[PDB]
Symmetry: D2
Subunit: 296 residues, 4 copies
């Protein structure tokens, strides 16, 4: 198979189950929403050395579609451990959104996706020291917590689902600039898919790893030397001097497959792309196997 | 004292010692440097519920002033615990900068500030799985760690210093929009001060807290209801309907004093500002007393 | 009538016919599309002393909805004079988009709205000095023009329609900061309305004018002193210390009505707003009257 | 001569004399300063089909270095014709800055560079309709013009100098993505040079042209087909698949020389750059020849 003359390797990305929440952040403006959003979702590329996997889903939610009639942004927070996720929701909303000028936080988990729920807003409400006050807002149960700026509004509870983490593909290109232009076009396409986010910096992984280490028994993971253009022993096609990985997490498998589809199609329009591939673990580790040829 | 008719309260901010690192991130462009910087410095407002206190120091470093001749940005990461700092350096550079497209990481601790150092680059280089190699760049010891993109460059070690955490001032305004416009102007000025950063979202604290809780034995901190304009029995001046706090950390006391001076001056140029104040514990807890009146 | 306690004056905005074009700009990334778009729509607030009224309609068009499969943005350019408009399309696309890295220009004038058209692409194609080549891309007739970067792609012709210019409303607020926070919220809402744009800087008019001058024969327009908070004999209601105007242009009356509706709704959610009004000439100059009360 | 293995052609850039103004724009925040600046400098790449050549010089000016103590940005506006320049200053400030929320405009022409001046603020002051008031701010003669937001502040007069226009170099690269990565790094360096600006979109020219046309006696200029990679009869080096040009205007020859120097060095750090050249007219047309070998 080829898309725009780019070979699509017949292989599969191997994904995993992970717990996920989805939060609507509103603010006085879209600018202040993004300020809160960038803080709340940072230090969140991978659960290996980061405390969560977080990112923006919908970059712009019109005022007339929010509970409070203010501009919004939706983010998603993921972790494989459900208690770790509830902690992360509390810490990230409590110290990155409650503290951010004019920002409010509401649940944006689709009812059809909702399996569990955590009363994060109830928990933060104690910050009001007895002055916090329950209210209803567009049918929603909210807490009004007095803060020095005025009030912080937060929904009582946030829904949790089991989503799909680790959807991926590799872009193989003739050079680093070519691979990066293709990679960013891919991420620009992924922005439009609802219920999916790319947690790595700018959506892009420049240092994909393998499980473990050939040399060091203390390392749980290490550089994927099979795909390192500067490692003399690599398994790369001729004329490939750069590989990028795009990693996608999502509410469900369909959202992750859709993100991968539009990401790959977008990447294949850009010059200097040699091959599209995907990372798996032989079928052994994860719960999902997303075959690239099945996307198209 | 008045600045532009705004009363400056005769009081002082009480600040503390905290361990700090200072990292230069370079990339193929300023855009890509900022991508890595925003990931690396997020989830980083307060050591209370976040893993670190992190922020941007210098938003633009010209290519001719970086060791690799590429565009850069300097960030600071801080923590009261030196061991937590070292762990945060490893995690944040390893998962937010090594993974970011084209980004490299160099030490930017001034030689005169350096008290200690940690070989963070050395510890990361094992990711190369035997293929990592030492090199010298602009007289710096660096590791070239082969990655799917090509190579990740990171300086062998990073300097640590005992800096100053928790310099602060309060902006008391006639309304929330007036308060916020004044607050952002203050942060715009602080951006120009070398060696100082404001770790809260957009530099601004919307939810200033107090130690402990009148109602709840289980809270380490709660809303500062003395300054909550919606709390019937607050201690705000007549006319004051919003308070914001700006929190500043820095390499040393002079950096923090300078940031407070230019922050307060800029805030006082904006309309609807009633009073400037600051927070302390009587001088009984912290290592630094910055008297507002001595700034000007 | 009140919206969130804000009085909506029972009056109407008077709008005019103007010629309008709508252009889709694609590029290697949304970032580079935005680079071209900002240049092409600048110096474009008002036909009084600018060459056109231009702005962004849809800030993000998904790659899979564009003819070339690359990320895009749609903009609109308007003028009351159809011959001026055709010149402005040629100059802005020729100097601002053809020159911009990786940018292509396509027609995005809806078939239903299309009244006339100009072969702007054909006229630009002569830049190829004989090397220009005609092609078809997604059913569209385009020119591929050889340039130093590679090729520039531009559709052969662009639709033109009679749209609606000068839909408006005034936000009357207690202070300049409260007014500006309300006005940006309003513009954030308008961003989401397809076929409407707000040509002034940030969508907001800080210096609303009246026709002619009381003191000067040589002026076509001057400050609207009735609404000037510092003019001792202004017509402002008690408590209003700042007025901002939002001016909206659009493909048709419905897009303008909708933009006014969502803009006013969003402005009224923000604190410190006293009254919404609008400007007219008694119904005796323009082609449209949009009564504010009929919007809700 | 080579820089980082990149061949520097022993040739010259031929530049011209042009009239130039340098304006400082302040606003309530750097955000609002930039909104006014983007509108004021747009539609301004080339005086061939644009009304002027305009661009950002210093993208951030500290509050303490401005006349009013607010965040600022400095822009430069040029034209070959003094009268056209004065008209562009009036129109761009009047329609794009006076109208922009919170924005003021001050002169930023260095004393030593000042040849002539035009009382632009005086001309705009008549907008006040007799309510405008002369004043002094930090030793500057300014006009306070009542507007619906409050007041517009503009300096009475603005200095004019004869600067240098059309300094330039060509980046020849192996691919379009490689060329564009080199080009943006180049412009990132030029940002740091005071008194110079790059008027094309993103600082970069994707469609460099030659004087006249081989085919069409009605074309004043056409594509430079000598450097067109898709033109069979081009004169490009082996392996060059894309050329970009950077055009640099400045207050004086030195400022232009420095921008070319740091831009070329930055470009040469990036992968896939084959050759640096420059464009001239055989010493025929312009007042300045700037030999690339002399920069280094």
């Amino acid at each position: 198979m080829e898309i725009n003359g780019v070979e699509i390797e017949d292989t599969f990305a191997e994904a995993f189950e992970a717990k996920m929440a989805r939060v609507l952040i509103t603010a006085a403006s879209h600018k202040w929403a993004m300020i809160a959003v960038k803080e709340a979702t940072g230090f969140g590329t991978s659960v290996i050395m980061c405390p969560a996997e977080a990112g923006i889903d919908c970059g712009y939610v019109p005022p007339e579609e929010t509970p409070d009639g203010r501009p919004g942004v939706t983010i998603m927070i993921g972790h494989n451990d459900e208690d770790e996720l509830k902690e992360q929701l509390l810490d990230r909303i409590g110290q990155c959104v409650m503290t951010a000028p004019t920002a409010s936080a509401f649940d944006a988990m689709p009812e059809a996706e909702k399996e569990d729920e955590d009363r994060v807003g109830y928990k933060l409400s104690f910050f009001g020291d007895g002055y916090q006050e329950e209210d209803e807002l567009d049918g929603r149960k909210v807490w009004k917590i007095p803060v020095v700026e005025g009030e912080f509004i937060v929904e009582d509870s946030f829904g949790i689902t089991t989503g799909v983490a680790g959807g991926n593909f590799y872009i193989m290109a003739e050079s680093q600039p070519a691979g990066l232009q293709a990679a960013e076009a891919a991420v620009d396409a992924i922005k439009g898919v609802e219920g999916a986010y790319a947690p790595f910096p700018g959506g892009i992984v420049a240092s994909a790893s393998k499980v473990g280490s050939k040399q060091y028994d203390f390392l749980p993971a290490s550089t994927n030397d099979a795909y390192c253009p500067t490692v003399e022993d690599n398994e790369l096609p001729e004329g490939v001097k750069c590989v990028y990985e795009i990693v996608i997490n999502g509410l469900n498998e369909e959202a992750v497959k859709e993100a991968m589809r539009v990401g790959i199609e977008a990447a294949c329009q850009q010059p200097g792309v040699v091959k599209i591939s995907a990372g798996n673990f032989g079928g052994k580790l994860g719960q999902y196997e997303i075959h690239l040829h099945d996307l198209f």
